Design a protein around this ligand. Structure first.
Ligand SMILES: [C]C1=[C][C]=C([O-][O-])[C]=[C]1
Ligand SMILES: [Fe+3]
Ligand SMILES: [Fe+3]
Ligand SMILES: [Fe+3]
Ligand SMILES: [Fe+3]
Lengths: 490, 305, 82, 101, 489, 306, 82, 102
């Protein structure tokens, strides 16, 4: 006979002990552990609500991979690469480049907790978290690898995080802040609670819905299987939050949540936003970017935050306004500066698409439509020089994404600047400036790519020299219009 | 810029003389944090974690021009690790099931439950220390192929911990008056036979240089556990008609031999730099006395009547 | 000599790096910014382009130079119409 | 106020990814929560299944609706997300809120 | 350490012994074993060339099914049922009804060998064969079961072999003759060699190519996985053939091969022929029926038969002519009598399809095209009573499929008849009559469905009465034109 | 006129179930069409040789029931779940073989144990192959697909035991090459007195062609005797001779054997809904028990010598 | 006086069950067969329909009856044009 | 037919591999392991027919090298949907071959 898990589970996490040959603070130094002075004994009440154990972990994970790989193998000849809309292929290139090696970096966030968290249950669940992120990094390198021989842009599934390309710097600045650059309790709150129960649902399930509409079941099945692991190890954050609240650290927990949600928002606005509202073919858009945000971030995540005892962030109304506006400008910029991307952005402004945009975002044509009108006429007149930039955008010193606003009939743009320690910084929002002010030593001597441009680090100091600095190794790798401007004929 | 054809694999692998394997594709050259010596992480160069990595990884006296070239001799990836370990662990769980059906624990020699309570069930603390320590080498190692071996080794350490938890609870069902599942923390903290091991591990867990962490954990501590804990426990079980524990430990020893395999492969890589022999030797000689004292105290406790 | 600014042009969607000269008039500054915006993402129009510090209520005189303005390199300006 | 109304919900329950557990989980939610209305939003790659305040899935019903032997732990092959806090054991999984909004 | 299979495999099949308490013939009766008087010791030289063993069998088959089910699960929302051409849906309905419970019947063919073959290796490989066909019958019930709630015609995946519908009778008459109704050695020769290395490749790989072109990967992936099992246990036939030849029974072996190939041909001409050349959308036809026949039956199977030491069948030239002609008439008949089918036949004679038919079968339009011309004009002029039959077709007493020929400009039709024991039988070919004559006791008292109609066993003696006799339980189950005659517009 | 009917949630024959049909129900139930027509089991001449065989040995069996198809395997196994279960158990046994071989287990058995193995253990491949052949016969004759499916998996299990014995005979012969292991088993099966009770039992059992008598003789008489009088005494003898592998191997084979008994008892219970069947079953049990008892006593006399 | 025959009509694709009457003339038999063939799968045409035993060289006379012909029930006939 | 005579008089042997992760490694293996033989490949999307004249060998070593993961010969039947020629298979390789030459 076998004994059920409930009868021996407590012994698997009965692993705290009182150190004698080193001090408790030597064994769990605050800079790596983040216990905020809460003593060892208090962390023993940590109780992970989504449990697993070694025998069932390897058994069930064997089954998950068997399915993910079997589906890929059975659909190799479905002609997805040959027959998909080019904007869908660009969505794949963008996803795998922005995600795969960051998943592998998440191993280190989990490893930080497995060694340095004072909660024994956290240390064990983070060991399975280490394994999960290894899976996700290896899956999302293995799957795009077959397309290397079709298209050099898929090399960026591996290469992006090794480059200084502007979007990879934005990704690395976020993930090094929330995953690999802070103590274990910050990781629990910023990564597993805020990022992994909040925003990853947009890219791994919202995008899966669009993928299923587009007929790409290898990809939809892959990323939804990945999110079943996420749903388990992300539950490390809640009990950490509760423990901090119980031990008088509510203010500190709230601040880490507020910061991590905003940082994740700006990155997902530039990656996921253009994908759901412009790259994804119109007929495959299950919901708009904003409708998905209201399902996953407002309706699901923010409600879960309230239920655990935290408050709406201080920037609530600013966030809602950002959802209506930011990604439309991020999309325009990624498109106009497409040669600096490793994927081919789709303009997404055919007449029927502009009707849908106007329905989903009333006023769109009188704002971003005004810019697209000028672009469209230049394409029609064969003034392609006017559709490619000869300077660089100004870049936020926090998100590493350019400073944008609302164009057209009611133009409004605001930069939030800051003098600090003899340096002038510029931020894309009042929340981004507040994030810097929460922990300036994390950020103060970082130079964004335009800071490096102006300091002589990018030679030649031209757009072409910046492209070389960003790591492009051939003409084919730089982004072009996804449809070679065929949308302009319509 | 020039025009170039697509490559059959990743750009960093396209110079290989053979077709890249599944292991090559998903494992090699994934730490971007080693690209920029002044800013491992994409933050302020003097951020706390940038200072940590510049001191404890970049400035380690254990140096190599190409750590990334290291290869797991077993070439394990996540998928094949779980295939191998689901086979081994379903075997161990099948052993648990059948030996329980047979009431194996009833038939051990009189008093063996007291030896297990003192010498076996507190091993969950030692194995958890190995788990914590392996996770530290994972996060600090300067190559993803090194770190991947440490990830799997962290999981194996939890596998051993879980075996011990399961068997500690199971033994207590037949022997409920021996402190099984109740006194292990006190024994780990206070019993003389565990104090050498616990001092060793508290000190090893505060060795933050990645190279010293690797050498002390995998070249000193873990081989001592094979020679001085695992195999003597097997001999004592033999003498006390415990026929389950020797089979369980044989399964665990297959993990431990795999850890020794990749460790020695890394040493062989490291020794390409002639400076590294003296570094590794100094660390081994630094940690061996603590390891030897740990073993001798444990063995005196195990051979106690 | 070279004088970098970050410039927001009226009805455009972003702020851009534009390098002007220390002794450029504000009229010259506006035209250097306009090069990167008008007939690219902003429709051309009649009127006089003016330069101001970002979000400010006061406009720099048309004939004032960058040197005379007190602007520092890398500060943010707007280019707007009367 | 559209944001207010989206936030002020008490919906809890599983998000099941496309596969062989979608219909059995819907049927189980109906059976194991009588006198709860079960809502279902189909997004093709996943289905969002919810009830007000509390939603229970028992292993026994799940096994009967799926049609093959089933342990609760296996649900994570197909549980892609969930609304509510989670309390899970060998006999059931329960999604629930501590607060009422 | 583990010892490799080569070192212990011989002990797994060292299982023959000399009976003492019953006789060898009592233990292995000829009627069930079919050893043809060949002594026990001679059968020990049987050496199966495609080996397996219990541990690796269960491990590998676990992996095969894991892939088949996980692919099905991941594609449930691919909208195959709602979006596919109706002719493709009919192909699925036809396939599952004709195959699923016949696969389960193949367990008994394998069980016959597992108990009654004198060759020890045969008895072991037939044990895995039993397991393989259990898999195939279960897979091909489980996969269509989800479509029951969409369409009553998918109930025939289970119901067909329990009915007296004419095509089901044709299937059961073939499978009970070659699978469940003869001795173990005849099963070895007729099932595993002739049918399972010969014709199933057409339905399980040829059709999979078409399924792949049609974008139905659940189905293509399923049937190609099934055929990996077939490829292993079909290799029981060759060694049995060799043994018979070595022991002076070449003539009898040749006769059983010749018979089984012709029987399988007539059945696949009515099942697979219409699917490949008419029901499958034109743009999804990887090759024509005849091109697939030349790849799989002539180029592959008949070459394998020669390599083993057998001869081309005596009826070679008749077979070749039949490949050019027969299925075009079978298709026309299934469509004209579509209400007697449990699937919806596609007519497949749009002008673009008629061009393709003319290219693949020069002369098609002056033959079958003449009949489709009459049918087409009636459809356009709304004379629908003339596109539904008011009598029964005449049926072959061997294949149970109606008697057909070549219509149109060079009309030629021939029935091969036989008076035997006070009864008049009619056959659709010289070979079908010859098959009857090879073993009259197997066939002489069987009555085909029109024999029953004329003898009073179908009440009422009408076409509606025949449809109810065939098991149709509701008006929705009977076949209709797949496209509702849109092809005539 | 034809009635109108809407689609059903499952097969027509299961649509009247109270419960939702299981995977087992869907793929296992009511698949023998050869029971539909009493006069022509098979779609051939009603007096074809195989139709005559089935009308005599299945349809005419004195064991009778109006609804054999309602029988249910109590373990509800299908091909997919059988392979999942046995891949687990068989990979466990193969791991035991591997590890005990590493330890050179066979060298440490009590002196002479190799000769007891060669005489009383390795010839079991003949006995287990008879069970394999016999199980396949019950498969092909049984009047319901749910019955036959139990027999299919039992046929495979018999081959599993045969293959264990083959592997261990060869393996043992590597440590003890001078005991006849893998060389003399046919001669022992055919001539050794301790095997002749079992051989006569099985040769006669394999010629009992009535489907009911075949099931009762095999599963209610022969196979319970092998559990009580071969499997368990071998385990006891191995324990007295420091063979620790064989008791664990037999424990795995006994899980198969207990499963065979479970579905057998469930079929007996289903049969006894017809009160007439009690005397039929008891009569066959009484007919075959003397042979089975003689088989056990002869085997046990051989085992307990040395 | 039902009399079943199996009949193949000229230019059709199959043989069909047709029930005639013992006292039908061959002209009347030909019309009963044609009912199931002409304007269904066979084009109408001028000419006189004749009946013969299957693939025989000799035609039955037009006025001869089934009873007079010596045909047995369920024998195969052809209906052709002269 | 001359067409039929020609179709029958072939000596083509080799695996038919169903669509999946073994198609490309088997094509590459057939080429590597039969040097100086022309390998022909017919792509039918659901399966690929791979052939050479008279005999065609697939070795386990090459199959593992081209597949990129551990592989044993018995696993081939997960993807070997049919084959032309007679078969000799062991732990090191499989050989498809004809006894006769037509
Ligand atoms: C129907 C059918 C039978 C047999 C074979 O495989 O087995 C196939 C199909
Ligand atoms: Fe992840
Ligand atoms: Fe994650
Ligand atoms: Fe089959
Ligand atoms: Fe088969």
């Amino acid at each position: 006979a076998m004994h059920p898990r409930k009868d021996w589970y407590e012994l698997t996490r009965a692993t705290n002990w009182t150190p004698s040959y080193v001090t408790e603070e030597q064994l769990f130094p605050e800079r790596m552990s983040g216990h905020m002075g809460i003593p060892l004994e208090k962390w023993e009440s940590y109780d992970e609500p989504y449990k697993t154990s070694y025998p069932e972990y390897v058994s069930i994970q064997r089954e998950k991979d068997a399915g993910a790989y079997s589906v890929k193998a059975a659909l190799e000849r479905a002609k997805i690469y040959e027959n998909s809309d080019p904007g869908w292929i660009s969505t794949l290139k963008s996803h795998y480049g922005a995600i795969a090696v960051g998943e592998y970096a998440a191993v280190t966030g989990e490893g930080r907790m497995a060694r340095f968290s004072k909660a024994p249950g956290n240390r064990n669940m983070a060991t399975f978290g280490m394994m999960d992120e290894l899976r996700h990094g290896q899956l999302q390198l293995f799957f795009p690898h077959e397309y290397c021989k079709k298209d050099r842009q898929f090399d960026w599934a591996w290469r992006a995080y090794h480059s200084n390309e502007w979007a990879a710097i934005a990704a690395k600045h976020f993930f090094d802040d929330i995953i690999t650059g802070r103590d274990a309790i910050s990781v629990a709150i910023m990564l597993t609670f805020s990022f992994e129960t909040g925003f990853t649902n947009m890219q791994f399930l919202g995008l899966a819905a669009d993928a299923a509409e587009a007929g790409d079941y290898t990809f939809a099945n892959l990323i939804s299987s990945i999110q079943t692991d996420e749903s388990r190890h992300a539950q490390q954050g809640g009990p950490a939050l509760q423990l901090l609240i119980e031990n008088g650290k509510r203010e500190e927990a709230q601040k880490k949540v507020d910061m991590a949600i905003w940082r994740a928002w700006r990155l997902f606005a530039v990656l996921t936003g253009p994908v759901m509202d412009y790259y994804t073919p119109l007929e495959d858009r299950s919901q708009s970017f904003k409708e998905f945000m209201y399902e996953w971030i407002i309706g699901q995540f923010e409600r879960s935050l309230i239920d655990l005892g935290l408050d709406k962030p201080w920037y609530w109304d600013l966030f809602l306004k950002d959802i209506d506006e930011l990604h439309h400008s991020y999309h325009m910029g990624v498109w106009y500066w497409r040669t600096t991307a490793w994927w081919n952005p789709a303009a997404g402004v055919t007449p029927e698409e502009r009707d849908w945009l106007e329905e989903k975002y009333p006023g769109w044509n009188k704002r971003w439509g005004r810019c697209w009108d000028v672009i469209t006429e230049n394409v029609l007149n064969d003034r392609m020089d006017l559709v490619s930039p000869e300077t660089l955008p100004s870049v936020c010193n926090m998100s590493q994404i350019p400073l944008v606003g609302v164009p057209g009939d009611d133009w409004n743009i605001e930069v939030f600047s800051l003098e600090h320690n003899g340096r002038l910084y510029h931020f894309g929002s009042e929340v981004d400036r507040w994030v810097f002010q929460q922990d300036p030593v994390q950020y103060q001597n970082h130079m964004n790519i335009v800071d490096r441009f102006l300091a002589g680090q990018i030679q030649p100091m031209t757009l072409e020299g910046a492209l070389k600095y960003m790591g492009f190794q051939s003409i084919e790798e730089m982004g072009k219009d996804a449809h070679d401007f065929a949308w302009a004929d319509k | 810029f020039e025009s170039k054809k697509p490559m059959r694999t990743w750009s960093h692998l396209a110079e290989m003389r053979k077709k890249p394997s599944e292991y090559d594709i998903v494992s090699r050259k994934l730490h971007y944090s080693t690209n920029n010596p002044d800013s491992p992480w994409e933050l302020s160069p003097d951020s706390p974690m940038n200072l940590w990595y510049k001191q404890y990884r970049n400035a380690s006296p254990l140096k190599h021009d190409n750590w990334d070239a290291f290869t797991d001799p077993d070439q394990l990836v996540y998928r094949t690790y779980n295939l191998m370990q689901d086979g081994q662990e379903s075997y161990v769980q099948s052993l648990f099931d059948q030996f329980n059906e047979r009431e194996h624990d009833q038939m051990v020699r009189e008093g063996w439950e007291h030896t297990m309570a003192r010498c076996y069930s507190p091993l969950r603390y030692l194995f958890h220390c190995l788990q914590m320590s392996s996770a530290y080498v994972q996060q600090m190692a300067p190559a993803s192929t090194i770190s991947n071996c440490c990830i799997l080794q962290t999981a194996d350490s939890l596998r051993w911990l879980t075996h011990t938890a399961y068997r500690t609870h199971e033994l207590s069902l037949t022997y409920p008056d021996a402190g099984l599942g109740e006194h292990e923390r006190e024994l780990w903290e206070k019993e003389p036979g565990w104090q050498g091991l616990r001092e060793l591990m508290e000190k090893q867990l505060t060795a933050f240089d990645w190279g010293e962490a690797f050498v002390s954990l995998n070249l000193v501590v873990k081989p001592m556990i094979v020679e001085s804990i695992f195999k003597p426990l097997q001999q004592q079980a033999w003498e006390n008609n415990d026929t389950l524990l020797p089979l369980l430990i044989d399964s665990q020893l297959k993990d431990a031999e795999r850890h020794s395999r990749w460790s020695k492969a890394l040493v062989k890589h490291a020794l390409e730099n002639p400076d590294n022999h003296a570094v590794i030797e100094g660390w081994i000689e630094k940690w061996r006395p603590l390891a030897d004292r740990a073993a001798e105290a444990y063995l005196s406790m195990l051979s106690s009547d | 000599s070279a004088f970098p600014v970050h410039a927001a042009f009226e009805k455009d969607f972003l702020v851009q790096l534009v390098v002007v000269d220390l002794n450029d008039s504000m009229d010259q500054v506006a035209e250097k910014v306009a090069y990167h915006c008008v007939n690219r993402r902003v429709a051309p129009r009649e009127g006089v382009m003016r330069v101001r510090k970002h979000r400010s209520t006061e406009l720099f005189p048309r004939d004032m130079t960058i040197a005379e303005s007190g602007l520092n390199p890398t500060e943010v300006i707007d280019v707007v119409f009367e | 106020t559209l944001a207010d109304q989206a936030l002020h919900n008490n919906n809890v329950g599983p998000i099941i990814r496309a596969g062989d557990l979608v219909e059995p989980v819907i049927e189980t939610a109906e059976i194991d929560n009588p006198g709860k209305e079960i809502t279902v939003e189909d997004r093709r790659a996943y289905v969002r299944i919810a009830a007000e305040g509390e939603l229970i899935l028992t292993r026994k019903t799940l096994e009967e609706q799926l049609g093959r032997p089933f342990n609760m732990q296996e649900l994570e092959i197909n549980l892609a997300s969930f609304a509510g806090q989670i309390q899970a054991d060998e006999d059931q999984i329960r999604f629930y809120f501590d607060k009422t909004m």
